[PDB]
């Protein structure tokens, strides 16, 4: 319902923002690999 929905929402947004900025490291590691490829 809104209440757990919203939190579940907050959440989700929060577990993305960890893989994301993981994803963002292995994008600058894949980045970094391209350069010196």
Partial sequence: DVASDAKAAAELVAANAKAAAELVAANAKA??????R
């Fill in 31 to 36: 980045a970094a690999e391209a350069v010196a």
